[PDB]
Amino acid sequence: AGDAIVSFQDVFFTTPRGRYDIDIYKNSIRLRGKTYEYKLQHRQIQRIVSLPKADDIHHLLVLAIEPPLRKGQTTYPFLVLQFQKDEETEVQLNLEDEDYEENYKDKLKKQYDAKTHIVLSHVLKGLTDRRVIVPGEYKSKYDQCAVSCSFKANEGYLYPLDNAFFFLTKPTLYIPFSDVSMVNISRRTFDLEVVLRSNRGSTTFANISKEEQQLLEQFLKSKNLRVKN
């Protein structure tokens, strides 16, 4: 972590399961585990998503990765970083004062003191040129931004974002609304079938409580998708 611009020590990742140092450089990031290290061109980061966990304790960061990270016979297109929602870090950027000027001043702070997730967002945001995708205007029956459901056998939570479906966590799944031909409903509980464009078939999230049906319909159609049953 010598000439790191900045290092985030001992971060808990759930995909891939482990604890990593995140060392950030100008054009790449290195994740540094006890057993594995991966290097990461900033430009491999396609999306940054910042979400609360429907759990009310943690807050997630999720980075979409293309090409995907390797370890080794498995491919990870998503890294999932978990933090305590309220955990904080003070960090000074390790930049010579003048190198901070000729470049990073516009995009980064010299000194941060915020919730760990917001400091890491900001730093990645500013170097990658990405906009952090966050919870939008969706809200469930009990004012949440995710519904409990399943994808295959995997029990989880569906985040209806302003431009995408986002499922957590057993596998993580990101489906942009532009990739959606239409959404179907069908059989307590119901099924949400997300039909892809371009003959890529359809992803079904089963077991959503009927109570959330109405609010999910009004939302998706407020997003101007085609909805039926």
Q: CATH code at 73? A: 2.30.29.150
User: Domains in the chain: how many in total?
Assistant: 2
Deposited experimental method: X-ray
My answer on whether 23 and 12 are in the same domain is yes
Instruction: Tell me which DSSP letter residue 213 carries.
Output: H
Domain span at residue 139?
135-229
User: Can you tell me the distance from the alpha carbon of 141 to that of 153, in angstroms, rounded to the nearest whole number?
Assistant: 25
Give the residue among 144, 167, 219 at the shortest CA–CA distance from 62: 167
Strand arrangement of the beta sheet that strand 28-32 belongs to: 37-41, 28-32, 18-24, 6-15, 75-84, 58-70, 45-52, 132-133
Three-state DSSP class for 153?
A: coil
My answer on whether 59 and 172 are in the same domain is no
Question: Could you say which of 134, 155, 173 is where a domain stops?
Answer: 134
User: Can you tell me the distance from the alpha carbon of 65 to that of 109, in angstroms, rounded to the nearest whole number?
Assistant: 25
Contact status, residue 125 vs residue 111, Cβ threshold 8 Å: no
My answer on whether 98 and 122 are in the same domain is yes
